Design a protein around this ligand. Structure first.
Ligand SMILES: O=P(O)(O)O[C@@H]1[C@H](O)[C@H](O)[C@@H](OP(=O)(O)O)[C@H](OP(=O)(O)O)[C@H]1O
Ligand SMILES: [Ca+2]
Ligand SMILES: [Ca+2]
Length: 513
């Protein structure tokens, strides 16, 4: 009991089995057996003694086995539960992409009416809202500037009852957190409703507060294209209307001149300049994607486009970002304050590339002559069907999904594919009743993904309830190319995107062609 209970509660057959398999007769894994596991099961490409040894060095608890270049079942588990055993590629959790292309080649973490903490009509505004977003890696922030008392511009949602805050206060906060999560450029989208004088105050504050961080002049040689994230490292740039508008402000707009959508076109006569940016509401963007997906795509190759939520989303609900990324849209602004599958997917995408806020787009979306249209799929580079098999084995210590303290979770898991329309899919396990500690599903799903480069796999765990809506227990969204194979643990996040240190799913993933 003292142990029985102890080790029995803390016993994981699925782990036992996996170990046994990799180990066979033996009670330990030799480097050779380990390397075999890494290759055969984990499909590691760097599978070899070096990797095996570092895994052992890092995770093997037994001094004996460690010294003797072996891995025990315990070390096996530890590796599996570590950052290396994470279904989300540890390698992609650092900046590894090419950060030297023009801004228009990356998806950019962007937020909508960043100052808001709640709804769009009467909820509060706060510098905190900016800090939170920035801490979540957001790169493109929104500032709605209005004239305030004492000649100090304030920020709030025009024509609503949303609380107000100061423009300067907002700038200081931004100043302080702009690069906490990433060193890459922050872009301030200014929606300017200020009088000429207050605009002057804006410019003053900008300069005074941002100081050298502020990009107030074109970079050298930045001639034909937008600068790259690298070239703009440590800088904050302004997006807004450029010469009703004082030059003080207007002159600070260098690479993001807010423009009205004209249309798309081959030459340089009618598809704005690389330093011109159009914004589209969700509704309008959809229509354009619906009618001219390829034009938009091609358009997005060398131009930044911003999309923002539909006006009816006064509750600050969010739309799916994927549908906009599928069109090459880079500044897909969501309401960062709102928990949901949308921000889940959003933050999943941006966890990629070191979480720096700039994720390089697939090459075919960086090809000015692509014929891609996520909506009307034809043969091309983007076509690379893969077969994904995901086995949801078990769950460990699922968070008590907010009830009180006497009901036990009745967990079930949902796995979804997000990507081009033809790839979207969703499957769910059965419900395990009254077990959040170590529910065991042992269910496998299989999906066919034709445009993996645009796909994300999401794991959501819910607390089933016949009576009511199933409670959301935890979630994890992984960009396709960061999805690791073999036995892995999916580390569950809360509604707010926070880590659940011990909440995981143990899965087995396989991706075949
Ligand atoms: O907040 P809402 O009520 O949804 O209003 C729109 C939203 O703030 C957009 O982010 C903004 O985009 P841009 O500043 O990029 O243009 C657009 O400005 P606009 O209509 O003046 O273009 C606003 O109308
Ligand atoms: Ca706004
Ligand atoms: Ca229950």
């Amino acid at each position: 009991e003292i142990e029985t209970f102890y080790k029995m509660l803390t016993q994981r057959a699925e782990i036992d089995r996996a170990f046994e398999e990799a180990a066979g007769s033996a009670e330990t894994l030799s480097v050779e057996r380990l390397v075999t596991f890494l290759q055969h099961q984990q499909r590691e490409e760097e599978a070899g003694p070096a990797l095996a040894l570092s895994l052992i060095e890092r995770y093997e608890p037994s001094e004996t086995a460690k010294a003797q270049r072996q891995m025990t079942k315990d070390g096996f588990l530890m590796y599996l539960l570590s950052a290396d055993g994470n279904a989300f590629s540890l390698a992609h959790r650092r900046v590894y992409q090419d950060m030297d292309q023009p801004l228009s080649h990356y998806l950019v973490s962007s937020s909508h009416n960043t100052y808001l903490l709640e709804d769009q009509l009467t909820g509060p505004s706060s510098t905190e809202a900016y800090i939170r977003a920035l801490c979540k890696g957001c790169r493109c922030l929104e500032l709605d500037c209005w004239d305030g008392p004492n000649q100090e511009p304030i920020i709030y949602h025009g024509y609503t009852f949303t609380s107000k805050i100061l423009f300067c206060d907002v700038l200081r906060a931004i100043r302080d957190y702009a690069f906490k999560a990433s060193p890459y450029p922050v872009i301030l989208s200014l929606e300017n409703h200020c009088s000429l004088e207050q605009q002057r105050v804006m410019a003053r504050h900008l300069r005074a507060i941002l100081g050298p961080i502020l990009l107030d002049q074109p970079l050298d040689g930045v001639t034909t294209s937008l600068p790259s994230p690298e070239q703009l490292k440590g800088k904050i740039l302004l997006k807004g209307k450029k010469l009703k508008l004082v030059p003080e402000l207007s002159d600070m707009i260098i690479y993001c001149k807010s423009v009205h959508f004209g249309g798309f076109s081959s030459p340089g006569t009618s598809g704005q300049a690389f330093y011109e940016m159009a914004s589209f509401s969700e509704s309008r963007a959809l229509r354009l994607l619906q009618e001219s997906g390829n034009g938009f795509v091609r358009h997005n190759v060398s131009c930044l486009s911003r999309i923002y939520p539909a006006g009816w989303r006064t509750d600050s609900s969010n739309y799916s970002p994927v549908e906009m990324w599928n069109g090459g849209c880079q500044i897909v602004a969501l309401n960062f304050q709102t928990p949901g599958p949308e921000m889940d997917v959003y933050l999943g995408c941006f966890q990629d590339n070191g979480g720096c806020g700039y994720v390089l787009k697939p090459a075919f979306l960086r090809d000015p002559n692509t014929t891609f249209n996520s909506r009307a799929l034809t043969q091309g580079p983007w076509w690379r069907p893969e077969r994904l098999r995901v086995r949801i084995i078990s769950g460990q210590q699922l968070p008590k999904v907010n009830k009180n303290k006497n009901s036990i979770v009745d967990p079930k898991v949902i796995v979804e594919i997000h990507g081009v329309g033809r790839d979207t899919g969703s499957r769910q396990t059965a419900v395990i009743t009254n077990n959040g500690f170590n529910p065991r599903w042992d269910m496998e799903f299989e999906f066919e993904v034709t445009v993996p480069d645009l796909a994300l796999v999401r794991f959501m765990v819910e607390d089933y309830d016949s009576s009511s809506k199933n409670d959301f227990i935890g979630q994890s969204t992984i960009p396709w190319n960061s999805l690791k194979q073999g036995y892995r643990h999916v580390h569950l996040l809360s509604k707010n995107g926070d880590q659940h240190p011990s909440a995981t799913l143990f899965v087995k993933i396989s991706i075949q062609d």
